[PDB]
């Protein structure tokens, strides 16, 4: 009656939260560990800390198809979390090795690919979305049941820096505001994305569906967010409004993923049913409001 | 209540010291240099310290006055380098200029550079420390278990061998194997202990003075399997560097230490991790 979950990418920013959420939810949790992590002091100490909490380590490589199928047949569900900072420009596409291994094994009840972000296929008029769309097309062709978890703006990347580029912590005097800071955004603590992911991966209501992560009180414009900050610090920030016009679309150096969120409005340009939204399907997840999220920075 | 500034608090050894200081009750400070603000792993780490009670001090190593400013906020400075050992000299000159530091522990937790390229560097740092007048403690004398024990002292890996193990020599050369968290804990009990001021403290928990063969058979008792041993002579050992002094010349226990200078006897309430227990997580 307990679900066996394999987390692929268990040592990344988002991967490690999913490993810990799956353990906190009672899942028998398996963590893919590649051959090349036996020389990496922080990856070994990280992987073996999951073991202390009950996880299991299964070694396999992505280049080695039999070790991948040998790996996914020890589990019921596969979650991939393969984007950001310990990954590469194309390691989303490496999930096609996983889909081809999952189909050969036949036992997989669900596959949750690396999707935690803007819903691609809402992005036909803008590549990250093409790699994620190609991984979905392979999932669906192979007949693997899926959940896509989408719709979130990572708080460590857009909230803790007041949506400032160039930094991950609040600025001391200035803040650039995009447009009129009037575009609604969905700032979410990545731990909440991970907890929602671990509650949904075996919920029968979400099989072969998309699950939007939009906890209501954290739907917030950028100026509403920096006003949660200004209030906490008691200090009003100097605000340069940046117009849609001012367009780095040319050969300086970076994204313009920012333009999709803070100008297009594309995280909140589509109402969500309460049968498609994570805060509503899992109301027991006391998600982190952004006034509490930011307090750690004062 | 001692205040402690931990320089290098995001390294593998620094981060254990920050947590050991906070656990002992010290008022622990960690530097956050300006290069940190784009690095997500350092940022998660640093603010995970704030959540446990530590305070961050913004400063940079190329701006002398913020280091001076940073060491004035605190009584004791512990450096732990893993990120370059000679940047402790800039630290030494700021600690001179601020004059308020009761004690400096420089980055030294490996093997003692008086037996003794990183030791010309550790000794240059010591001579700056003692030229400058700064009361000091040198915590030395240990093989970190994550580099020499979990792998049963195999090179190229950090997890134990499946079926073949290499034995250096007869494997009857005594080595000292210490969990790095006990190095951090000892480092936290010692930084303000009146007896270790201007002394050198040896981390040599007696039950973890082991030959490589004795360690390989702590593993053989846990698993109940015998590994295939290939004995590798001194001369066959050819391309650390450091493996040859530790395992063929026995550098870690040429000198027998007194109970006045050794952490497990100065602090016997520290129930250090034995290798029969450190290795359990790998089965």
Numbering used by the authors:
A (entry chain A): 8 to 133, 139 to 266, 274 to 317
B (entry chain C): 9 to 91, 98 to 130, 139 to 261, 274 to 317
What did the published study say regarding this structure?
Pinoresinol/lariciresinol reductase (PLR), an NADPH-dependent reductase, converts pinoresinol to lariciresinol and subsequently to secoisolariciresinol. Here, we present crystal structures of IiPLR1 from Isatis indigotica and pinoresinol reductases (PrRs) AtPrR1 and AtPrR2 from Arabidopsis thaliana, in the apo, substrate-bound and product-bound states. The crystal structures were captured in the apo, substrate-bound and/or product-bound forms. We found that, for all 16 structures we solved, each enzyme adopts a similar head-to-tail dimer conformation, strongly suggesting that each PLR/PrR functions as a homodimer, consistent with the literature that TpPLR1 exists as a dimeric entity in solution. Each structure contains a head-to-tail homodimer, and the catalytic pocket comprises structural elements from both monomers. β4 loop covers the top of the pocket, and residue 98 from the loop governs catalytic specificity.
Several regions (α5 loop, α9-helix, and α9 loop) are partially disordered both in the IiPLR1_apo and IiPLR1_NAP structures, for which the differences can be characterized by a RMSD of 0.287 Å, whereas the β4 loop is well defined in the apo structure. Intriguingly, the β4 loop is well defined in the AtPrR1_NAP structure but disordered in the AtPrR1/2_apo structures. These structural differences suggest that the loops are somewhat flexible, and act as a switch to control the binding of NADPH and release of NADP+. Residue Lys144, which corresponds to the previously reported Lys138 in TpPLR1 that serves as the general base for catalysis, forms direct hydrogen bonds with NADP+ in IiPLR1_apo and IiPLR1_NAP.
